[PDB]
Design a protein around this ligand. Sequence first.
Ligand SMILES: Cn1nc(C(C)(C)C)cc1NC(=O)Nc1ccc(Cl)cc1
Length: 330
Amino acid sequence: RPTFYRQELNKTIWEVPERYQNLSPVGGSVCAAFDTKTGLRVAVKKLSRPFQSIIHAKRTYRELRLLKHMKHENVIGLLDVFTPARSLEEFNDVYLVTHLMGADLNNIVKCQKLTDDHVQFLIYQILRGLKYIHSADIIHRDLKPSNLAVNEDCELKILDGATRWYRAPEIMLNWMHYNQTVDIWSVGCIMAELLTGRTLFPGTDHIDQLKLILRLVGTPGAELLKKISSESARNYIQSLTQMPKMNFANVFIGANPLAVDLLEKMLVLDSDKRITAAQALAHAYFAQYHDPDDEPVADPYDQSFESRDLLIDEWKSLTYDEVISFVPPP
Ligand SMILES: Cn1nc(C(C)(C)C)cc1NC(=O)Nc1ccc(Cl)cc1
């Protein structure tokens, strides 16, 4: 068992094993640090008050369960996890160690002239990562460029860290049923912004958002109005100047016509028609990169915990178990 050392960092105290040197803040909260066991440079997040409340403690436990299960290269992975505590009773603090990645898709897209080749490779890696996540019955629900870690090899990982811009219409008419293809909506929103340099749908709020979305894809016709339960929603949507679906080739006129088509298949209002990750990875656009023998799915994820109402000490303790049974990767 490791031997620790304490430290005063940006108000916050920090106690991590000595395998970790030259901790310096990056913005719970995060330090860039040096992994002496591996030479490699890592991210260390101290969760902020992991067990302050039921919602906190269940979050913390969901956090540890998600990171622990994620083993794919376009998705954040967990190198190490630790607490300074020796007992369940002591147990108050949780630290997460992960690959240092530094920059996000924002830090790229706003200061590098992007080819169509970058676009292809960046979307392809989102989608392959989305495939793996979707296969475990996890929906991300918040895909946006700050949730995509990109390195200098332009190599990409998904994680969780203006939301509404990338959100499906149906998650703004708080529907709660969502298929996985809320994520393919965000992906479409992201790809377009790469091709283009501009936010596809910069709603000024959740009312604007829909105006803006409807302007491009058009108001829903009969087949779609059928599936809308709420008297509210239908009353709102049916209450607009009925709108034409715009011609994507016009909207994204200079773009690669294969990327355009893919957007069409991605930004479909009725989420039964949205292409999936597995299907997009096959679209012509990614023929440079596609490889059906290198597009793994995830082991089954047990997430029945999600519907337990538990006390702080049960979540806590479950979290402790989880820290304990941690085996590093290979
Ligand atoms: C909550 N969550 N969900 C996912 C997905 C959906 C991609 C599996 C990933 C995460 N969690 C994180 O991304 N957690 C995390 C931990 C340390 C750092 Cl430096 C940054 C982020």
